Structure 1
C-alpha cells in the first residue's frame, strides 16, 4: 500500500561497494515504505563490520564472504558478483582479443585495498597461476580507482556493478568472470536479534530468495555452512 507505521531502528554495517552500488535503490524503496524506522548505515572494514554487529550496535552486516570472521553470526547468501577489467582504449589489453590472467599480470594493477571487496579472489587467482601481480594502486572506492586508471597509472580491476559505460564512457570494460572466481555478498546478524517485520522486508528486498520462512529456517540451522547449502540447488542473483 502506502506506508508502514512500524517504528524501530535498523543499523547496517557494510562496505563502500555495497553502500555505493548495491544499496541505494533498496534503501530508497525501504525509506518511503518504512517511514518511522530510523535507518543507520556505517561503512567499515570487514573486521569492523563483523565487530559492529557482533559486539557493537549494528543489526545487519552486509559484506562479501570473509572466512571464519562472521563465524558467530547468522550469514545468508544474497547474490554472486565478479570483476571487470577497466583500461583506456589505447591499452594493449583493449586490443587483445581474449585476455587471460597471464596477459593481465604483465601490467601494473589498480584495484581494491587488501582484504576488501573480494581482493582475496584476485590474489588467490594469481597465486594459483603462480603469478605475482604488480599492484601499484589500492583503494576502497571504484571511483578513484577509475580516476587513476585514466591517468595511465595502470589496469583497473573493479566490481562489474561498479562500472557503467553510461557514466564512464571513456573507459573499456573487460569481463573477468572466467578469470576470477565469483564473490558472494552475504547478509548477517546476531542470533539474539529479534527480527522485526521491516527487517524481513529489507532482507527479502535485498535478497528475494530470503523470504521470512527461509530466513527462519536458516536461523534454526545454527550453521552458516548448512544455510549456504540450502540454496545449492538454485541459481542465486548475479550482480
Structure 2
C-alpha cells in the first residue's frame, strides 16, 4: 500500500563489504517503497567505483576512504567502522584480553588487501609501532578470509560487521578498535547530479544523520574538507 509512484533510476557503485553487510537491509527497504524506481548496482574495486560515478556510469559511490583520491566531486560521511580479529578456538590469541598491537604481529596474518576495504592502517599502523608483521593472505572480502582462518593459514583481521555468531560460530571474535583506528564509510556523488527525493530518502536510511538539509548544506559548502569538518562535533554511527 505504502508506495511512492516516483519514476526514475538509481545507479549505485559499491564494494563487497558494503553490499554484503551494510546495503542489503537498505536495498530491500528501498525497492519496497519505490517500485517505479529502476535500481542498478555495480560491485567493483574502490578505485574503479569512484571512476564509475565520475564518468556518469553510476550515481552514488558507497565505499570507504578510497574515494579521497578523487577530488572530483562530493563526498559525504556515513558511518564509522573498525576491525576485529578472527581466530580458531584452538588459537593462543583466543584466550586473551585484550590482544595488543605488538602481540598480533607475532602471528601470520590474513587481512584486507591494500586498497580494497581498509588495509592500512595495516602495514602502516605497524610502521608506526615499528613492527614488521608476516602477512600471508590479502583478500578483497571477509568471506574468503574466514575460510582461510578455518584452514589455519593465519590470523584473520576483518570488519566487525563481517562477523556474526550463528552465521560464523566456529570462529573466535576479538575487538581491535583499541588496536586499529576506525575507518569512515563515505558516499560519493556529483554536484551536477540532481538529487531526487528517492535519493535523499536512500541516504538518510543508510545514514540517519544525513537529512536533506544536512545533505544540501554539505553540497552548498564547495569543499569536501569543509564537509568533513562540519561533522567535527557531530557523531557518526559506529560499526
TM-score, normalised to structure 1, is 0.97
CA deviation vs aligned residue, 1:185-223 (integer Å, no higher than 9, x gap): 001101110101001010111011110011111111011
- Shift in Å at residue 51 of structure 1? 0.5
For residue 229 of structure 1, report the CA deviation from its aligned partner.
1.1
Question: 1:33: how far off?
Answer: 0.7
Is the contact made by 1:121 and 1:183 (CA closer than 8 Å) also made in structure 2? no
| SS of 1:119 mapped into structure 2 | coil
Three-state SS of the structure 1 residue aligned to 2:62 is: strand
**Aligned partners of 1:121, 1:138: CA distance in 2, in Å?**
13
Post-superposition CA distance 1:21-73 (Å, at most 9, x none): 00000000001011111111111111101100011310000111126423111
Match of 2:182 in 1: 182
TM superposition outliers: structure 1 runs of 4+ over 3 Å? none
Who is 2:125 aligned against?
A: 125
CA pair 221-33 structure 1, distance change in 2 beyond 3 A: same
- Structure 1 range deviating more: 170-179 or 115-124: 115-124
**d(CA) in 2 for partners of 1:146, 1:216:** 40
Q: Any unmatched runs of 5+ in structure 2?
A: none
Q: Cα distance, 1:141 vs. partner?
A: 1.6
Shift of 1:169: 0.8
Corresponding residue pairs, total: 239
Change (3 A) 1:67 1:190: closer
Task: Indicate if the aligned counterparts of 2:47 and 2:66 stay in contact, CA closer than 8 A.
Answer: no
- The alpha carbon displacement at 1:144 in A equals 1.5
Name stretches of at least 5 consecutive residues in structure 1 with no aligned partner: none
- The TM-score normalised by the length of structure 2 is 0.97
8 Å CA contact 1:63–1:186 kept in 2: the answer is: yes
Q: Hey, what's the Cα distance between the residues in 1 that align with 2:56 and 2:133? A: 37
RMSD of the alignment, in Å?
A: 1.1
Task: Assess if the C-alpha contact under 8 Å between 2:110 and 2:156 holds in 1.
Answer: yes
Aligned residue for 1:118, secondary structure, equals coil
> Do the aligned partners of 2:117 and 2:141 also contact (CA within 8 Å) in 1?
no
Provide closer, same or farther for how the CA distance between residues 46 and 124 of structure 1 changes in structure 2, counting only shifts above 3 A. same
Q: Distance in 2 between matches of 1:202 and 1:68?
A: 22
Pairwise CA distance, 1:112:
1.2
Structure 2: distance between partners of 1:166 and 1:84: 17
